[PDB]
Every structure is written in structure tokens, then in C-alpha cells.
Scaffold this active site. Structure first.
Site, PDB file in Angstrom:
ATOM      1  N   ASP A  47       0.829  -1.196   0.000  1.00  0.00           N
ATOM      2  CA  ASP A  47       0.000   0.000   0.000  1.00  0.00           C
ATOM      3  C   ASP A  47       0.866   1.250   0.000  1.00  0.00           C
ATOM      4  O   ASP A  47       1.486   1.579   1.016  1.00  0.00           O
ATOM      5  CB  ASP A  47      -0.916   0.014   1.224  1.00  0.00           C
ATOM      6  N   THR A  80      -4.262   4.754  -5.899  1.00  0.00           N
ATOM      7  CA  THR A  80      -3.488   5.845  -5.322  1.00  0.00           C
ATOM      8  C   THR A  80      -2.011   5.620  -5.571  1.00  0.00           C
ATOM      9  O   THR A  80      -1.268   6.562  -5.869  1.00  0.00           O
ATOM     10  CB  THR A  80      -3.757   5.950  -3.828  1.00  0.00           C
ATOM     11  N   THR A  81      -1.574   4.370  -5.451  1.00  0.00           N
ATOM     12  CA  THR A  81      -0.290   3.995  -6.016  1.00  0.00           C
ATOM     13  C   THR A  81      -0.277   4.217  -7.520  1.00  0.00           C
ATOM     14  O   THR A  81       0.642   4.845  -8.049  1.00  0.00           O
ATOM     15  CB  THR A  81       0.020   2.535  -5.705  1.00  0.00           C
ATOM     16  N   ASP A 378     -13.924  -2.798  -0.080  1.00  0.00           N
ATOM     17  CA  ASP A 378     -13.411  -2.673  -1.436  1.00  0.00           C
ATOM     18  C   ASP A 378     -14.389  -3.269  -2.433  1.00  0.00           C
ATOM     19  O   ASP A 378     -14.707  -2.649  -3.453  1.00  0.00           O
ATOM     20  CB  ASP A 378     -12.058  -3.363  -1.543  1.00  0.00           C
TER      21      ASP A 378
END
Lengths: 509, 107, 66, 127
Positions: A47, A80-81, A378
Site C-alpha cells: 500500500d 493511489t499507487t 473494497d
């Protein structure tokens, strides 16, 4: 106080390493970076949002990278990565050259046209979905869960995501935009099993109402949400002097009775048993209702009542006069105090509007449930993302290698100095494929040049390299899929993100 | 919950007491307030009758002295209702909060 | 909404408002206006107009007469 | 050890006695202002010139002819007297009551609080 090219460097500089180490962490096949605390605290994560944190952060644009990251962590939290990869890709390639070619500017512009071509290609490269067929949706969720390698309970939670989130989806601007999430209500529950959970109608009230005198079950009494102003009026309509003496106790408490009733009779006018009293809560208010044998649930959140506003699909009522079902407790509706585990849970079901359910979660206990919930979280969002977007794309390099050609085809056709971004844009698509080629652990230059050809004829419509299949492949047969927006949402960000730091030549304190 | 339902049974049981003897006192005060009329009413006309409340006794005529003093009777007769009204209301209250103590115990 | 080309200057002020939903007249010519920054709403009057209870209706009329 | 819990019980007993006394007395002292207030309504009513029988001294009562109903006293300051109008005198009577009223008032909040803490010590007593 920081300047220009050095910012522009520090842009490319930081945003490089910003874009990087979590791509080893990227892919269902991944590489988890270790993170050491200065005390020696060790961390293993895929993450970036997590990786963004323990690392000591100084470069304020890296802070700004953390921003659009958290900004995207707000939106999806996944990618986001992946969003900061491409801005790192973007900022790396065109910037230094084209700023040593003197401009953020043509760089700025062409990402407008980097954006749209793919946005175009997206609608071409992504294919619509059956949100009608949850299985057509399920495979996505089956796909959504497994990059971080969680299946076991999620395989069910996959379905349960589909179920509620289509129901917790009722939202309209008249263009019918559905973001609605807070409708979906989740339940920490002891006992049951991760493979046993459900979605119950309205909004089940779990968190702060165990309250045992709600009665237990409401067959069809109403639940009452009070923006009344049920607070006893010590005078006629008003609150008289306090009670410091016997005389103030008799006269004032009597008039305190009427205002409770006359509103609670207006509450009775909609005939409840359960009244969850939020504004105007009075020690006489519940007591009267408890004397009315109307269970009056106090010491309660309006958040619960907002959950209850979505539990009956209703609103909450400031009206003292003439309280209604459609005012509060819309629809016939239910209220039930249920013990899942032994925790008392108010279940207010049957919203007046259909598409009414909220997610019950049972694990073997809260924790192994939380395993479900976190991954269901998720799972459930991808739904409203597929419910957001009923188009979806063969992923990987297929997603990647598609537009660059049109983009280069543009750059070739556009043949400006904007062509240079479309060149700088072209291969930035292929970095996660490089990561995918990392994910398979293979030779990238080949697979690129190989997948480059795979877009020369096949046009890489479904054809990327999938590191998890290892190979240049149809991503439709292989079934790599995400709702189009998510792709764009990852794609839209980095453009603006790069374009953001593309504006900065100046840090100043 | 129970505490506020405990609080009303205490606030009642203390304040329900006094009004009960308060009516009693005024029933008494009605009497001399009436009887202090008769004693000067006993004198059929007395203008050396002095109606006065405290230390001072001002000369007046017994007539309005009596007109005062059947009201003083009445006034001293009056609040017994209020002082009975204050009475009867509280015994009804102590059991209500006593109930929501018990029913919310049971629920 | 509608067409992007139908953007129009209009005579005076097309409200951003809650129209009257009670069967409100949707045209009153030459409006003498009360522009209210003040909400009309309601408050509880323990005793409204009249007194008499000739009916269980009349029991509810008092506080209704407000 | 053993006497300390024995000490504070009947200690807090008397504060009840004291405050109940003080409010009782501050229920008393207020009552005479309206007395000074009301006796002026009577003297206005009957007239200046009515026989007033006022106490002279112990068991002695002295007569007099009423005069100056508008001239009526407020006793204030340390040792000082303001005769006031028939209107004004009745005002500061009302005032000094209200000065005494919250003075009288907070006594019972002080009164009632001292007993349960004796009880709290009496609770620990039989404990």
C-alpha cells in the site's frame, strides 16, 4: 523558498521515487517493500498510501503527491499507487526536456489531449457491463479482491457487495448521479461466519443502538426521527423558570407534560412504538412515551437518525405539529432489535423507497468479520464504481498499449511540439506493464516491443501483458476488468497531478 | 434512564409532604381571620375599633374592617385548594417515574 | 438542462425557490410581493382560539385554531 | 480512625440546623418589609388624622393622630433613615426583600446539601 528548474528537478526528482517503489508492490504478483521505523519498527505493505506515511517526508510537492494520493485515497484508495505512477511517468518524461525546451505550457495543453484521446479510447477500450447481472459484476469483484490476494470470505462478500450497493444505490440529481454509500450500512457482529452475512432492508441500526427498550421488534409501529424540538416546554409553549423549590415543581412539570404529549400525540398521530428522540430529548420526553408505552430511544445519534433517515428512507422532522409517516418512518417499514451474536441490533427495514438493504456482516467473530468488511468495503465500492460506470476494460497493457498509438498517431498527426508530450504520453502507459512484466518477472523491453506489436495489428484492445498470466494476452478471455471510470479515475488524476506540479516552479514559506 | 426516573420519585416524595399540612394551616387561618371579624362584629358599631396589622393600630370603622376580614377569611381560606392541588398532583407523579424505573428495568 | 443553446435572458427574475405545492396559483398578475427572509413555520399554542368542547372535534379545534 | 467517621456525621447535622434557621429567619426578615409596605396602604386609605395606636414601650401602647401618609420611612445605610414617598418606601421594602430573597434562597441549596453528606457520613457510619 524554492525555485524553478530545481523545483522542476525536485518535481521530476521526488515524483520519480514517489512514483516508484510501490510498483514493485503493485500487481497481484507484487514485491512488498520493507519499512523500518527509526526505532526499528518494521513494515511490509503493498500500500503506497501506507508506504507514504512512515517514510520521512520533506519535499512539499511530495506532500502534495500525498495530497492527490489521499485525495485519490478518498476516491478509491486503490490506484493511489497507480495514479502517482503516471504523473511520475508524466513529470519525468516531457518536463525536463520540454522545460529545457522551455515550457510547462505545451506540456500542460497536450495532456488535455492526452486525456481526451484515452477518454475517447476508454469508451472504445472499456465495454459496458450488466449491473443487471451481478455475476457480470461479480467477476470484477472476484477480480477486485485478489490483487492484494484476499479471496476466502470475499468470494461471498463479492456477491454481498453486488447486492446492497445496487440497492444502497438510489440517487438522483435528475441526471441520476449515484454516489450513495452512507445508505449502505455495515455491521460488526460476533459469531456467525464470514461465509454467512447479508443485506437487510432500510438501514439496520447496529453501531450505537443496542437499546433494549426499543421494545425488540416493531411489526408496523413507526420509527420517529425528531428534529422536533420535543423538549418539554415548562410553560405553555415555552420553558419557564427552573425548579429550586416545591412550587416550581408542581406547576412547571405539569406544563412540561403537555408539550411532550401534544407532540408525542402528533407522534402518536403517525402511531409509533419506537421513537428515537434526537432533538428536543427530555427526561420527560421518553418517560411520557414510556408512559405512552411508546419506546422512546434517547441518548442517540442523529447519525443513527441519518442512518434511520435512510432506514425508513425518510427525513427527520422539525415540525412539532401533525407528525407523519412520510414525515418520519416513511413506508410501512420495520424496526427490530436483533441479536446477531448477542449484540442487540435495531433493524429498521423496508424503506419507503425500494433498493433498500444494508449489509449485515457476520464473521466467526468481529475480527474475521472485519476481514470480510474491509475487503467487502473494497468489493462494495467497486460495485458503486461499476454502478457509477457501466463500462469496463480489458486491463493491463491492453488498457495501457491502446491509446499511445492513437496518442502517437495524434503526435504524428498533431506534429507540433504537442506531439512531444504525446510521445512523452505514449509509453507512460506501459510502466505498470513493466510492473506487470515485473509481476511476471520477465523481460520488459521484449514484452513492450512485443506488446507494441500486439497493438500494431490486434491494436492491444484486449491485449496487454498480464504479469499474473505472465504473457501478452487478451484481457477479456483472461478477464482483467475494471469499470471504465476507475481506469480514467486513475488516469484523470495523474494528468492533473503532473499538470499540478507542472505549474510549480516556486515553493515559498 | 433510571436515574432521571429515580430523580422524580425523590423530588416528589419530599415536596408532596408540605402542601398536605399547608392546606391544614390555612383552614386554621381562615378561622380567626373570620373569627377576628365576629369579635368586632360583636360590637354592632364600633369606630374605636382599631383595625391594624402589626404594632400600630390605626383607627378605622369596623365596616370595611370586616370587609377586609371576610376576605382575610377568604384569602386565608383560598390557597387550601392550591395547597391541596399541589398535594394531590405529586402522589400521581412519584409512581410514574417509579414505573419507568421498573418498566425500563424490564425492557 | 434542455439545450445548451436555450440559455436565455428572461424578464425579471425566474426564481430559485420552492414553488407553492398546495395548488398554488402559478400566475398572479402584477404581484405585490412579500419577500420573506423569515420562515412562517408553526409553534405550539397549548390553547388556541375558542374554548368550548361540543365535540371530540372541538377538543382538537382549540390548539388547531392557531 | 474510629472517631473520625463519628465526627463529620453530626457535624453536617447542624449546618442543616443553621441554614434552616437562617432561611427561616431570612424568611422572617423579609416578611416585615411588606408589613412596612402594606401599613402604608392602610394609612393612605383611612386618612391622615385617624387615631393610630402604636406601641409606646414594653406592654405600653401610645396613641396619635395620623399625619403625612406620603412621608414614610426607609431604614437603610448603617444608622440612617430615608423617609420616602408613599410610593418610594414600598419600593425598597420590595427591594430589600429581594436582596434578602436570593440571600434567603441559596440557604436551602446550602441547607439541603449538608444533610445528605451527614447521611453520607451516617451511611459510612453503619458501614
Amino acid at each position: 523558498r524554492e525555485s524553478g528548474r530545481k523545483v522542476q528537478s525536485g518535481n521530476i526528482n521526488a515524483a520519480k521515487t514517489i512514483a516508484d517503489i510501490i510498483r514493485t508492490c503493485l500487481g497481484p504478483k507484487s514485491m512488498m517493500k520493507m519499512l523500518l521505523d527509526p526505532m526499528g519498527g518494521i513494515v511490509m505493505t503493498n500500500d503506497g498510501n501506507a508506504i507514504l506515511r512512515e517514510i520521512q517526508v520533506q519535499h512539499p510537492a511530495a506532500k502534495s503527491m500525498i495530497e492527490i494520493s489521499r485525495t485519490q485515497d478518498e476516491e478509491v484508495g486503490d490506484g493511489t499507487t497507480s495514479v502517482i505512477i503516471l504523473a511520475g511517468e508524466m513529470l519525468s518524461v516531457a518536463e525536463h526536456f520540454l522545460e529545457q525546451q522551455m515550457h510547462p505550457t505545451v506540456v500542460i495543453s497536450a495532456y488535455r489531449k492526452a486525456l481526451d484521446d484515452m477518454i475517447s479510447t476508454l469508451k472504445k477500450i472499456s465495454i459496458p457491463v450488466d449491473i443487471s447481472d451481478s455475476d457480470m459484476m461479480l467477476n470484477i469483484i472476484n477480480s477486485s479482491i485478489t490483487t492484494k490476494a484476499i479471496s476466502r470470505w470475499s468470494s461471498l462478500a463479492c456477491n454481498i457487495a453486488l447486492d446492497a450497493v445496487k440497492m444502497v444505490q438510489f440517487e438522483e440529481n435528475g441526471r441520476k448521479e449515484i454516489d450513495i454509500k452512507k445508505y449502505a450500512r455495515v455491521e460488526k457482529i460476533p459469531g456467525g461466519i464470514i461465509e454467512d452475512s447479508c443485506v437487510l432492508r432500510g438501514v439496520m441500526i447496529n453501531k450505537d443502538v443496542t437499546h433494549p427498550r426499543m421494545r425488540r421488534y416493531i411489526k408496523n409501529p413507526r420509527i420517529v426521527l425528531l428534529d422536533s424540538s420535543l423538549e418539554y416546554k415548562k410553560g405553555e409553549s415555552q420553558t419557564d423558570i427552573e425548579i429550586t423549590r416545591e412550587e416550581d415543581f408542581t406547576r412547571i412539570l405539569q406544563m412540561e407534560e403537555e408539550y411532550i404529549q401534544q407532540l408525542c400525540e402528533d407522534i402518536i398521530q403517525l402511531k409509533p412504538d419506537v421513537v428515537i428522540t434526537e432533538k428536543g430529548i427530555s427526561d420527560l420526553a421518553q418517560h411520557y412515551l414510556m408512559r405512552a408505552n411508546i419506546t422512546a430511544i434517547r441518548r442517540v445519534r442523529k447519525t443513527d437518525n441519518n442512518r434511520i433517515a435512510r432506514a425508513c428512507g425518510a427525513r427527520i422532522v422539525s415540525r412539532p405539529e401533525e407528525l407523519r409517516e412520510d414525515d418520519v418512518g416513511t413506508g410501512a417499514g420495520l424496526l427490530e432489535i436483533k441479536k446477531i451474536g448477542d449484540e442487540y441490533f435495531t433493524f429498521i427495514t423496508d424503506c419507503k423507497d425500494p433498493k433498500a438493504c444494508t449489509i449485515l456482516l457476520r464473521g466467526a467473530s468481529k475480527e474475521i468479520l472485519s476481514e470480510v468488511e474491509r475487503n467487502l468495503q473494497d468489493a462494495m465500492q467497486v460495485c458503486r464504481n461499476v454502478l457509477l460506470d457501466p463500462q469496463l476494460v480489458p486491463g493491463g497493457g491492453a488498457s495501457e498499449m491502446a491509446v499511445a498509438h492513437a496518442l502517437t498517431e495524434k503526435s504524428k498527426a498533431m506534429t507540433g511540439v504537442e506531439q512531444w508530450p504525446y510521445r512523452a504520453v505514449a509509453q507512460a502507459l506501459e510502466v505498470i506493464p513493466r510492473t506487470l512484466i515485473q509481476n511476471c518477472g520477465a523481460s520488459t523491453i521484449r514484452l513492450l516491443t512485443s506488446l507494441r506489436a500486439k497493438h500494431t495489428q490486434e491494436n492491444c484492445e484486449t491485449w496487454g501483458v498480464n504479469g499474473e498470466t505472465g504473457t501478452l494476452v487478451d484481457m477479456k478471455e483472461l478477464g482483467i476488468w475494471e469499470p471504465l471510470a476507475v481506469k480514467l479515475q486513475t488516469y484523470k488524476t495523474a494528468v492533473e497531478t503532473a499538470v499540478l506540479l507542472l505549474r510549480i516552479d516556486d515553493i515559498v514559506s | 434512564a433510571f436515574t432521571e426516573l429515580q430523580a422524580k420519585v425523590i423530588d416528589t416524595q419530599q415536596k408532596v409532604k408540605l402542601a398536605d399540612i399547608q392546606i391544614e394551616q390555612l383552614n386554621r387561618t381562615k378561622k380567626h381571620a373570620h373569627l377576628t371579624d365576629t369579635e368586632i362584629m360583636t360590637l354592632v358599631d364600633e369606630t374605636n375599633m382599631y383595625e391594624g396589622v402589626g404594632r400600630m393600630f390605626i383607627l378605622q370603622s369596623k365596616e370595611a374592617i370586616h370587609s377586609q376580614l371576610l376576605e382575610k377569611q377568604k384569602i386565608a381560606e383560598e390557597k387550601i385548594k392550591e395547597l391541596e392541588q399541589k398535594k394531590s398532583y405529586l402522589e400521581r407523579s412519584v409512581k410514574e417515574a417509579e414505573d419507568n424505573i421498573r418498566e425500563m428495568l424490564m425492557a | 438542462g434542455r439545450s445548451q443553446m436555450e440559455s436565455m435572458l428572461i424578464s425579471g427574475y425566474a426564481l430559485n425557490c420552492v414553488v407553492g405545492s398546495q395548488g398554488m396559483p402559478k400566475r398572479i398578475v402584477n404581484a405585490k410581493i412579500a419577500c420573506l427572509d423569515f420562515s412562517l413555520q408553526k409553534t405550539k399554542m397549548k390553547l388556541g382560539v375558542q374554548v368550548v368542547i361540543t365535540d371530540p372535534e372541538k377538543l382538537d379545534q382549540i390548539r388547531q385554531r392557531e | 480512625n474510629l472517631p473520625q467517621l463519628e465526627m463529620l456525621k453530626n457535624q453536617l447535622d447542624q449546618e442543616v440546623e443553621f441554614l434552616s434557621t437562617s432561611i427561616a429567619q431570612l424568611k422572617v426578615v423579609q416578611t416585615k418589609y411588606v408589613e412596612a409596605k402594606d401599613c402604608l396602604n392602610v394609612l393612605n386609605k383611612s386618612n391622615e388624622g385617624k387615631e393610630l395606636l402604636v406601641p409606646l414601650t414594653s406592654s405600653m401602647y401610645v396613641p396619635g393622630k395620623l399625619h403625612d401618609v406620603e412621608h414614610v420611612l426607609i431604614d437603610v445605610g448603617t444608622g440612617y433613615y430615608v423617609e420616602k414617598t408613599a410610593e418610594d418606601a414600598k419600593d425598597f421594602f420590595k427591594r430589600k426583600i429581594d436582596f434578602l430573597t436570593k440571600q434567603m434562597e441559596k440557604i436551602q441549596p446550602a441547607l439541603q446539601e449538608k444533610h445528605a453528606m451527614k447521611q453520607a457520613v451516617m451511611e459510612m457510619m453503619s458501614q
